Write a protein that binds this ligand. Structure first.
Ligand SMILES: Nc1ncnc2c1ncn2[C@@H]1O[C@H](COP(=O)(O)OP(=O)(O)O)[C@@H](O)[C@H]1O
Lengths: 70, 50, 28, 395, 50
């Protein structure tokens, strides 16, 4: 009784994701931990193009985070 | 404009969708939320237009 | 392969309306 | 409509000649009485007078409900579109005979009484599983069986087409038929050929598609299959490929195989346990016959077991002819170059040859037919067999 | 040199119940109306149903 109502929001999400005008300044930012269990209908040219990962730090970035907190 | 004040103190109208018609000038319409109704047609409209 | 499932509920909404020409006193 | 239920002489006895001519007399006289109604008082009493009494009796807006249960004769319980349920009385205007639970009705406003019934649609399950029309070729396609044709005809067709001999001796026809043999023999052909020339409904079921990744749906599809087959018509149920879904209790394991055991256990009871199903013809097809559960093999369930051998040089001469009946043939070819030589290859291999020769010719954009078409096609179908063979030298 | 017809039709049309019984109908009308035509498809049904 449920995944009908769930997926029709995703359709309602994707429909109003596509057709703004390519002129109205609206920025959409989304964030999870798991970028794997997703519909690739989000992963289309036109809806979501920039894919940015936030990986674990390294020796230089550990020095920078240690500098700011301490 | 002077006549208009009484005419909008008058009830509205529903909107529904015809599933398909049947015999004797009747159709079958689910309205928006509720069930399906077997109703009458007008005298200005035709069965073939449905 | 041989796996059960539970369920859920999607309750409908409800609405009411009247002619609203009824007075509610009758007392006194 | 249900005018007289007697059929009990069931022959050219003089009793039926007397009874049916009584029925001829009571029907002519009822007609000739009522013919003299539109002759001397030819009145139109109930064209609209019956209708305008009732169309004014029922409301002008009609509302569709749903039956839940039926109580004694006039009052039953219904359900509105939202779930509000009403204990309303039905009128004597609706067909009470097609009024079973789970059907749409027509209601009233004030008393909400059941006024009429809306007719049902067609269920999707027939459109899924039924081979709807006569699909393919008739007995001009088959290559010389003539005994296997004779067994299936007197088990299904002659019982169905001319039932008169069984009811002379009172002996019921046998129920189940197993089709078995090496693969590529024509088991699917013989089912579709009887499905071509028939008078009752035919149902095709692929047995491998009876394994759901949910559970309980195995027996659920079975108990609805014979339910549809019984309620619809005179029916012939064909289930191809039961060998790899219903074999035996080989290790009595769990985790899926126990579920497969439960599906066949329901099918075994749904085949024959209780209240003999009537006008239900069950035809089953396998490749292997030995690793089958003997509780299905016993009589009472299946009574006919038909071997399907492979002919060597005799019926092939038509199978090579029929598959080349609609194509060209240049004069450089002899079918006896291949029929006389090897004696084991299937009729499916013959179709694999007779298509590949059409493939080899038009790939090289040539004219009709060469002998080397049939040379290279026969060579290819050898490797179509042999490249999946692990056989060395005498095992 | 045939009229190319690309049908994406992925899942936004798979949800549409009431017009789901016609989307193939007038599409095959469009193929036999325009030209010698070639209709292209993709994975969309296999993701929907098997
Ligand atoms: N006697 C025959 N006459 C004509 N064609 C045949 C004959 N035997 C086999 N064939 C061809 O071989 C195929 C046989 O199908 P079938 O043996 O029923 O497959 P399976 O047994 O694997 O279900 C058919 O496609 C048919 O064209």
């Amino acid at each position: 009784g449920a995944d009908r109502e769930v997926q029709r929001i995703l359709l309602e999400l994707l429909n109003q994701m596509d057709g703004f005008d390519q002129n109205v300044n609206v920025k959409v930012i989304m964030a999870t931990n798991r970028a794997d269990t997703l519909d690739p209908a989000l992963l289309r040219p036109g809806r979501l193009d920039r894919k940015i990962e936030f990986p674990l730090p390294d020796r230089r970035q550990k020095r920078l985070i240690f500098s700011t907190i301490t | 404009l002077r006549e208009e004040l009484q005419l909008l103190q008058e009830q509205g109208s529903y909107v529904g969708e015809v599933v398909r018609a049947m015999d004797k000038k009747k159709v079958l319409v689910k309205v928006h939320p509720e069930g399906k109704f077997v109703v009458d047609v007008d005298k200005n409209i035709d069965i073939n237009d449905v | 392969x041989x796996x059960x499932x539970x369920x859920x509920x999607x309750x409908x909404x409800x609405x009411x309306x009247x002619x609203x020409x009824x007075x509610x006193k009758x007392x006194x | 409509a249900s005018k007289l239920p007697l059929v009990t002489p069931h022959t050219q006895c003089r009793l039926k000649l007397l009874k049916l001519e009584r029925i001829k007399d009571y029907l002519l006289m009822e007609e000739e009485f009522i013919r003299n109604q539109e002759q001397m008082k030819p009145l139109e009493e109930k064209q609209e007078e019956e209708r305008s009494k009732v169309d004014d009796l029922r409301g002008t807006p009609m509302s569709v409900g749903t039956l839940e249960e039926i109580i004694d004769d006039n009052h039953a319980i219904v359900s509105t579109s939202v779930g509000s349920e009403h204990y309303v009385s039905i009128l004597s205007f609706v067909d009470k005979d097609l009024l079973e639970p789970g059907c749409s009705v027509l209601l009233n406003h004030k008393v909400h009484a059941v006024i009429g019934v809306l007719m049902d649609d067609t269920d999707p399950l027939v459109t899924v599983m039924k081979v709807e029309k006569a699909p393919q070729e008739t007995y001009a396609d088959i290559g010389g069986l003539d005994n296997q044709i004779q067994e299936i005809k007197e088990s299904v067709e002659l019982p169905l087409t001319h039932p008169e001999y069984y009811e002379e001796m009172g002996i019921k026809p046998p129920k189940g038929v197993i089709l078995y043999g090496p693969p590529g023999t024509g088991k699917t052909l013989l089912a579709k050929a009887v499905a071509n020339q028939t008078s009752a409904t035919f149902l095709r079921v692929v047995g491998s598609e009876l394994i759901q990744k949910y559970l309980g749906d195995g027996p659920k599809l079975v108990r609805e299959l014979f339910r549809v087959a019984e309620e619809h018509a005179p029916s012939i149920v064909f289930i191809d490929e039961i060998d790899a879904i219903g074999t035996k209790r080989y290790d009595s394991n769990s985790g899926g195989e126990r579920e497969i055991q439960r599906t066949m256990l329901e099918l075994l009871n749904q085949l024959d346990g209780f209240d003999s199903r009537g006008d239900v013809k069950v035809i089953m097809a396998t490749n292997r016959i030995e690793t089958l559960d003997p509780a299905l093999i016993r009589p009472g369930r299946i009574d006919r077991k038909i071997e399907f051998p492979l002919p060597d040089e005799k019926t092939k001469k038509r199978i090579f002819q029929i598959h080349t009946s609609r194509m060209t043939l240049a004069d450089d070819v002899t079918l006896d170059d291949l029929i006389m030589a090897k004696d084991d290859l299937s009729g499916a291999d013959i179709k694999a040859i007779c298509t590949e020769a059409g493939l080899m010719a038009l790939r090289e954009r040539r004219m009709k037919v060469t002998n080397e078409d049939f040379k290279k096609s026969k060579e290819n179908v050898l490797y179509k067999k042999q490249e999946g063979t692990p056989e060395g030298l005498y095992l | 040199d045939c009229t190319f017809i690309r049908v994406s039709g992925s899942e936004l049309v798979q949800k549409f119940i009431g017009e789901g019984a016609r989307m193939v109908r007038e599409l095959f009308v469009m193929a036999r109306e325009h030209a010698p035509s070639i209709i292209f498809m993709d994975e969309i049904d296999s993701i929907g149903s098997s």
